[PDB]
Design a protein around this motif. Structure first.
Motif, short mmCIF file in Angstrom:
data_model
loop_
_atom_site.label_atom_id
_atom_site.label_comp_id
_atom_site.label_asym_id
_atom_site.label_seq_id
_atom_site.Cartn_x
_atom_site.Cartn_y
_atom_site.Cartn_z
N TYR A 95 0.76 -1.44 0.16
CA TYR A 95 0.39 0.07 -0.07
C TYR A 95 0.88 1.19 0.67
CZ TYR A 95 -3.90 -3.00 1.30
OH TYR A 95 -4.71 -4.20 1.82
N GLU A 96 1.77 1.44 -0.47
CA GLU A 96 2.51 2.18 -0.54
C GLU A 96 2.56 3.01 -1.74
OE1 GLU A 96 4.18 3.56 2.27
OE2 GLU A 96 3.71 1.07 2.68
N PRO A 97 2.56 4.14 -1.99
CA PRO A 97 2.81 5.51 -0.76
C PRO A 97 1.58 5.24 0.43
CG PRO A 97 2.79 6.53 -2.91
CD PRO A 97 2.23 5.57 -3.13
N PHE A 98 1.82 5.07 1.16
CA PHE A 98 0.73 5.02 2.26
C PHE A 98 -0.12 6.20 2.27
CE2 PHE A 98 -1.45 4.14 6.62
CZ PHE A 98 -1.37 2.68 6.19
N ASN A 99 -0.18 7.23 2.63
CA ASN A 99 -0.58 9.02 2.84
C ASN A 99 -0.95 8.77 1.21
OD1 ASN A 99 1.59 9.55 1.06
ND2 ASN A 99 1.91 11.03 1.88
N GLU B 206 7.86 7.82 -9.45
CA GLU B 206 7.02 7.16 -9.31
C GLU B 206 6.64 5.87 -9.45
OE1 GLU B 206 3.53 9.80 -10.54
OE2 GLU B 206 3.29 10.38 -7.86
N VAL B 207 6.54 5.52 -10.56
CA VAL B 207 7.07 3.90 -10.99
C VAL B 207 7.75 3.80 -10.37
CG1 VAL B 207 6.90 2.55 -12.95
CG2 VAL B 207 4.99 4.90 -12.95
N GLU B 208 9.15 4.04 -10.47
CA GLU B 208 10.53 3.48 -9.81
C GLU B 208 10.79 3.35 -8.04
OE1 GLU B 208 12.55 2.22 -11.79
OE2 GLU B 208 13.48 1.53 -10.62
N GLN B 209 9.74 4.16 -7.82
CA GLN B 209 9.41 3.61 -5.83
C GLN B 209 8.52 2.02 -6.32
OE1 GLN B 209 10.36 5.44 -2.99
NE2 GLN B 209 11.40 6.56 -4.57
N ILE B 210 8.42 1.83 -6.73
CA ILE B 210 6.78 0.56 -6.47
C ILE B 210 7.72 -0.52 -7.31
CG2 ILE B 210 5.10 -0.84 -6.96
CD1 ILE B 210 3.44 1.73 -7.71
N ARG B 211 8.76 -0.05 -8.76
CA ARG B 211 9.88 -1.01 -8.76
C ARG B 211 10.62 -1.04 -7.47
NH1 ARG B 211 9.29 -2.56 -14.39
NH2 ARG B 211 8.54 -0.27 -14.64
N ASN B 212 11.20 -0.45 -7.36
CA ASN B 212 12.83 -1.06 -6.28
C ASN B 212 12.40 -1.49 -4.99
OD1 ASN B 212 15.11 0.66 -5.83
ND2 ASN B 212 14.51 0.78 -4.21
N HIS B 213 10.87 -1.27 -4.84
CA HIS B 213 9.99 -2.05 -3.48
C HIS B 213 10.08 -3.63 -3.70
CE1 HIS B 213 8.15 1.63 -2.02
NE2 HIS B 213 9.26 1.81 -1.88
N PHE B 214 9.24 -3.75 -5.07
CA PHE B 214 9.13 -5.59 -5.74
C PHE B 214 10.59 -5.91 -6.17
CE2 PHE B 214 4.30 -5.13 -7.29
CZ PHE B 214 4.01 -4.85 -5.39
N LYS B 215 11.59 -5.45 -6.63
CA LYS B 215 12.53 -6.03 -7.33
C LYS B 215 13.28 -6.73 -5.82
CE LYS B 215 15.77 -3.82 -9.08
NZ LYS B 215 16.73 -3.21 -8.12
N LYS C 118 -4.26 4.68 -12.37
CA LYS C 118 -2.95 4.80 -12.23
C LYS C 118 -2.23 4.30 -11.38
CE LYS C 118 -2.40 9.34 -15.07
NZ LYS C 118 -2.45 8.62 -15.96
N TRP C 119 -1.84 4.44 -10.21
CA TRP C 119 -1.76 3.42 -9.19
C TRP C 119 -2.15 1.55 -9.32
CZ3 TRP C 119 -2.51 0.26 -5.23
CH2 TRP C 119 -0.93 -0.19 -4.18
N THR C 120 -3.25 1.80 -9.19
CA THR C 120 -3.56 0.21 -8.87
C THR C 120 -3.06 -0.37 -10.30
OG1 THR C 120 -5.79 0.70 -8.39
CG2 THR C 120 -5.53 -1.48 -8.77
N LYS C 121 -3.38 0.04 -11.58
CA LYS C 121 -2.89 -0.63 -13.08
C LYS C 121 -1.17 -0.54 -13.20
CE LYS C 121 -1.61 2.55 -16.46
NZ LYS C 121 -2.05 3.86 -16.74
N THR C 122 -0.45 0.80 -11.92
CA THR C 122 1.43 0.00 -12.01
C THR C 122 1.21 -0.70 -11.44
OG1 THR C 122 1.36 2.42 -12.44
CG2 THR C 122 3.12 1.20 -11.67
N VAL C 123 0.91 -1.31 -10.29
CA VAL C 123 0.82 -1.99 -9.13
C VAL C 123 0.80 -3.99 -9.72
CG1 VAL C 123 0.69 -3.79 -7.08
CG2 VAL C 123 0.70 -0.95 -7.16
#
Length: 313
Positions: free
Chosen positions: A198-202, A227-236, A267-272
């Motif tokens: 659930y990031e970014p949580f805010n 923004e996409v790189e935050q999530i990609r960084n997390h998942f990787k 947008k957020w949901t698609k990206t995740v």
């Protein structure tokens, strides 16, 4: 084409949905949701592969050892599972929202063991399409360490009656992506590890009155390179750890709350979904109706394109 069993069973989860705010409430319906049989047909027709079902077993058990489950309630869970499998959905049942276990794990851990002794026993002869998940989001006093101590004890009990059923093992500290390295695995060939994103949580929990302090509304998520790189960084990070520990990943929850603006959610949901897919994580959207809902119960229609965001078709 000798493939790992865990990994093939994880593929069967595919793109799933959570049946949220229902059996993990104190009493089913007391939060606004009551599972109707039709729900599962509806979920199957939309294209979902699986449903994940939060269950508060701990509100439906005997006060005295060995903590037998109220038969009505167990009959109710058995009904709901039958109906989901009748609709060819893979089905995950968990233990969810065990408040006492969060506060006093040493005392209540043995209640979870017991709870699962009875659930594994009742479900022992179900088709392999039903997966178990010991507990949702260990947290608070159920630390990474206690969780590493507790969950194998429960695992051991389930394995007496269900020797190969997939058991899903949640990451501790709310199953946050960064606590993956804190999970201590066991030598079991039929386990899946699960985190929740659930990031970014805010962003995802803007306006959620149940968060303290409650967060401001009007926070955007715009699909920008950074923004996409935050999530990609997390998942990787999750992927690199799953690979080194020879274990499949299930992203057991992801969703943005309805007080966020719709464009950002889509947008957020698609990206995740997309990033979850690229790393070969199975996934399950939080949740079906209610505050993060994909499905509008009044109109009896899916909310779009959000549902497409979550499902990918």
């Amino acid at each position: 084409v000798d493939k790992s069993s865990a990994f093939e069973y994880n593929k069967m989860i595919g793109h799933g949905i959570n049946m949220g705010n229902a059996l993990e409430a104190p009493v089913e319906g007391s939060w606004g949701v009551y599972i109707e049989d039709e729900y599962f047909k509806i979920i199957k027709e939309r294209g979902f592969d699986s449903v994940r079902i939060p269950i508060r077993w701990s509100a439906h058990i005997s006060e005295k050892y060995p903590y037998e489950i109220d038969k009505f309630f167990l009959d109710r869970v058995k009904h709901v599972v039958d109906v989901a499998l009748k609709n060819d959905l893979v089905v995950i049942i968990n233990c969810h929202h065990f408040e006492e276990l969060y506060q006093a794990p040493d005392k209540y851990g043995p209640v979870l063991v017991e709870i699962w002794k009875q659930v594994a026993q009742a479900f022992k002869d179900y088709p392999d399409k039903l997966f178990f998940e010991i507990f949702n989001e260990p947290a608070q006093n159920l630390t990474p360490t206690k969780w590493n101590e507790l969950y194998p004890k429960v695992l051991g009990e389930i394995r007496k009656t269900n020797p190969s059923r997939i058991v899903i093992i949640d990451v501790p500290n709310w199953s946050n992506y960064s606590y993956v390295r804190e999970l201590k695995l066991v030598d079991d060939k039929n386990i899946i590890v699960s985190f929740h994103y659930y990031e970014p949580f805010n962003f995802t929990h803007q306006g959620a009155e149940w968060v303290s302090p409650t967060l401001p509304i009007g926070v955007k998520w715009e699909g920008k390179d950074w923004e996409v790189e935050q999530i990609r960084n997390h998942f990787k990070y999750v992927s690199e750890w799953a690979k080194k520990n020879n274990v499949p990943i299930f992203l057991g929850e992801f969703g943005a709350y309805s007080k966020a603006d719709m464009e950002s959610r889509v947008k957020w949901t698609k990206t995740v979904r997309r990033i979850a897919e690229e790393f070969g994580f199975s996934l399950a959207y939080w949740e079906f109706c209610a505050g993060f809902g994909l499905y509008d119960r009044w109109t009896k229609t899916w909310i779009e394109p959000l549902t497409t965001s979550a499902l990918g078709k």
